């Protein structure tokens, strides 16, 4: 599905806006060095310019959305990114030899600093064929991105990978197809290695059968895991139109669906999908803003742009959640 694939352009636009303004990198929360903080910005800037070489249409969409980004949206992107990263980093620090599987990775570049930071990390990026082909093109065309992953300019990887370069793999898969998915995982991961699974704005685009089988199958496949999921929720308090409005706005405007947004309309309902894991934690992103962001960071962000409407930020961010499920 082209339309589902193109939701990544929004995610990338948001990432680039946050970096351009300076919300990210957050060197404390993302545990970046002086050099990697610089590279973080450089890598993303290069991605954008390289995207332009490969697609006028995609660049246009990203470019226009990124320059029109509002502060409330930038705070969202910041919270989403440092929330996920904080969870990843705690686990990688504790477990030196680990494998990360990023499900529906789109244009995500968090592997670039992570692979440098953690010598025994192995990382697998998975998305639809058309999406990974574009990412592969970009990563190999840009000199600084090539250097960051040790890539040849040429496509030297053999099916089933587009990149198969040591501790990093990029592979096409339709994650609605569990047989394809398990066959892929069988040749790029091992059962016994501690595993982080990432689903950042992936599961919201799936029907419940597909998302549940994906969760159940992948938790069954690895002995020792942490699943970090980020997604919107419809909202549970009465007279909360957020979910209804979002679904209507997405169908009307873009012919896009979020099939379980109203089903899993609270953080509790959402987290229940991982109830086979013994250790499940869920917070909305306002809770993250108030309890996990240090005061030093709130002050920094206040220096970048005016957030004139803090309540509006709250109303939005209570509709995004970060779920951490751990099993062994």
Ligand X SMILES: C[S@@+](CC[C@H](N)C(=O)[O-])C[C@H]1O[C@@H](n2cnc3c(N)ncnc32)[C@H](O)[C@@H]1O
- 185 in a labelled binding site: no
Residue of the chain from 31, 36, 170, 200 that contacts ligand X (CB under 6 A): 200
User: 71-94 vs 7-21: helix axis angle to the nearest 10?
Assistant: 90
7 binds ligand X (CB under 6 A): yes
Which one of the spans 24-32, 105-113, 221-229, 292-300 is the region binding ligand X (CB under 6 A)? 105-113
- 175 in a labelled binding site: yes
- In the complex, minimum distance from the CB of residue 81 to ligand X, in angstroms, rounded to a whole number: 9
Structure token digits, residue 223: 């002995």
Structure token digits, residue 231: 């997604």
Structure token digits, residue 112: 């670039």
Based on its alpha-carbon atoms, the radius of gyration of the chain, rounded to whole angstroms, reads 19
- 249 in a labelled binding site: no
Cβ closest to ligand X, residue 23 vs residue 128 = 128
Residues 152 to 181: which contact ligand X by CB under 6 A?
173-176
- 164 in a labelled binding site: no
- In the complex, minimum distance from the CB of residue 8 to ligand X, in angstroms, rounded to a whole number: 4
Which segments of the chain does DSSP mark as H helices, in order? 2-5, 7-21, 34-54, 56-67, 71-94, 111-117, 129-141, 143-149, 178-186, 208-221, 242-254, 267-271, 285-291, 295-302, 310-317
State phi, psi for 148 to the nearest 5 degrees.
Answer: -65, -30
Which one of the spans 71-79, 101-109, 137-145, 249-257 is the region binding ligand X (CB under 6 A)? 101-109
Cβ closest to ligand X, residue 4 vs residue 89 = 4
Cβ closest to ligand X, residue 87 vs residue 202 = 202
127 binds ligand X (CB under 6 A): yes
85 binds ligand X (CB under 6 A): no
139 binds ligand X (CB under 6 A): no
Residue of the chain from 91, 128, 168, 289 that contacts ligand X (CB under 6 A): 128
Task: Count Cβ neighbours within 10 Å for each residue of 19-55 and write b for 16 or more, e otherwise.
Answer: bbbebbbbeebbbbeeebbebbeebbebbbebbeeee
Structure token digits, residue 193: 């290695």
Secondary element (H or E) of residue 283 = strand 279-284
Structure token digits, residue 181: 């998915």
Residue corresponding to tokens 């970090």: 228
Q: What angle do CA 54, 59, 64 make, to 5 degrees?
A: 175
Residue of the chain from 18, 32, 202, 226 that contacts ligand X (CB under 6 A): 202
Residues 293 to 312: which contact ligand X by CB under 6 A?
none
Q: How many residues bind ligand X (CB under 6 A)?
A: 20
- In the complex, minimum distance from the CB of residue 236 to ligand X, in angstroms, rounded to a whole number: 23
- 60 in a labelled binding site: no
Residue of the chain from 25, 71, 106, 225 that contacts ligand X (CB under 6 A): 106
DSSP structure class, residue 203: G
131 binds ligand X (CB under 6 A): yes
Binding site: which residues? 80, 104, 127, 174-176, 200
Binding site for ligand X (CB under 6 A): 4-5, 7-8, 11, 104-106, 108, 127-128, 131, 173-176, 200-202, 205
């Amino acid at each position: 599905e082209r339309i589902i694939q193109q939701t990544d352009y929004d995610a990338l636009s948001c990432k680039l806006a946050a970096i351009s303004v300076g919300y990210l990198p957050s060197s404390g929360l993302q545990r970046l060095s002086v050099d990697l903080s610089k590279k973080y910005t450089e890598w993303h800037r290069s991605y954008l310019i390289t995207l332009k070489k490969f697609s006028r249409r995609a660049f246009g969409k990203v470019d226009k959305a990124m320059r029109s980004s509002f502060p409330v949206m930038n705070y969202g992107t910041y919270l989403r990114t440092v929330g996920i990263d904080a969870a990843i980093l705690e686990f990688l620090v504790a477990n030196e030899k680990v494998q990360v599987v990023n499900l529906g990775c789109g244009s995500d570049l968090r592997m670039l600093p992570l692979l440098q930071m953690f010598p025994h990390l192995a990382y697998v990026d998975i998305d639809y064929n058309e999406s990974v082909e574009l990412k592969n093109s970009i990563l190999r065309e840009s000199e600084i991105l090539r250097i960051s992953l040790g890539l040849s300019k040429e496509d030297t990887a053999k099916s089933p990978f587009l990149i198969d370069q040591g501790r990093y793999k990029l592979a096409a898969c339709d994650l609605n197809d569990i047989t394809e998915t398990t066959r892929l995982l069988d040749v790029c991961t091992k059962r016994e290695i501690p595993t982080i699974v990432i689903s950042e704005c992936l599961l919201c685009y799936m029907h419940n059968n597909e998302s549940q089988l994906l969760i159940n199958t992948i938790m069954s496949k690895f002995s020792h895991g942490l699943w970090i999921s980020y997604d919107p929720i419809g909202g549970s308090q009465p007279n909360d139109r957020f979910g209804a409005i979002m679904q209507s706005n997405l169908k009307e405007s873009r012919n896009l669906e979020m099939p379980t947004l109203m089903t899993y309309n609270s953080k509790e309902k959402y987290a229940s999908r991982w109830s086979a894991a013994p250790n499940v934690i869920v917070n909305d992103m306002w809770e993250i803003f108030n309890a996990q962001i240090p005061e030093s960071e709130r002050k920094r962000l206040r220096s970048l742009q005016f957030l004139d409407e803090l309540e509006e930020l709250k109303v939005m961010q209570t509709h995004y959640i970060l779920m951490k499920a751990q099993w062994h």
